[PDB]
Design a protein around this ligand. Structure first.
Ligand SMILES: CC(C)c1cc(C(=O)N2Cc3ccccc3C2)c(O)cc1O
Length: 208
């Protein structure tokens, strides 16, 4: 069973801006996803301090970067808190309506696209490089779900019968044809060092 949803008009607008604005500094997408992963890992870590059973779905708190040149995908995996069905539908747990509004106001007053993450809508920077994004997620309080969107105003949600993950979020970037540099090991290392050097969790870059 696949449910199709319309993005709120503001989010559809934000996505169209990201996809259609000329902006060469696309590499910032990765730091935005690593930042989201790090936030989700902080959440599970903090909740686990009063309830250790929250880590029964996995004790390791980490980030994996998985390039696949055959599929032309870059996948960002974490073992953070994950998201419920309600969170996914509600703009992947972001303050997207108010954040978009504030972001647009900032862009009028001298901000640029790289500042997207300051407004809580950094996830959408995935569309700088990806023609389609798949989000697989597992929260302790819910079952596993796949969110998907190629933009164009809509997204889908279905139950994911997996590859079960114990807990966390997997972001699969189906890269645009001209963005395959982000599958190269030396390029990924360079971007992690430039923008995400000092992060509170291990980042493992998988080799092919
Ligand atoms: C898709 C994107 C928004 C994203 C989400 C997560 C995620 O699971 N969460 C849950 C959570 C709880 C508190 C604070 C932030 C977050 C983000 C993720 O792990 C990675 C992502 O790219």
């Amino acid at each position: 069973e696949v449910e199709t949803f319309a993005f709120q008009a503001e989010i559809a607008q934000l996505m169209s801006l990201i996809i259609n604005t000329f902006y060469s500094n696309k590499e910032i997408f990765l730091r935005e996803l690593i930042s989201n992963s790090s936030d989700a890992l902080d959440k599970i870590r903090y909740e686990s301090l009063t309830d250790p059973s929250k880590l029964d779905s996995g004790k390791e708190l980490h980030i994996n970067l998985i390039p696949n040149k055959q599929d032309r995908t870059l996948t960002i995996v974490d073992t953070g808190i994950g998201m419920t069905k309600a969170d996914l539908i509600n703009n992947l747990g972001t303050i997207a309506k108010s954040g978009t509004k504030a972001f647009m106001e900032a862009l009028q007053a001298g901000a640029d696209i790289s500042m997207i993450g300051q407004f809580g809508v950094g996830f959408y920077s995935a569309y700088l490089v990806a023609e389609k994004v798949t989000v697989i997620t597992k929260h302790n309080d819910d079952e596993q779900y796949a969110w998907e969107s190629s933009a164009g105003g809509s997204f889908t949600v279905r139950t994911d019968t997996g590859e079960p993950m114990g807990r966390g979020t997997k972001v699969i970037l189906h890269l645009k044809e001209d963005q395959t540099e982000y599958l190269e090991e030396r390029r990924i290392k360079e971007i992690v060092k430039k923008h995400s050097q000092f992060i509170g969790y291990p980042i493992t870059l998988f080799v092919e």
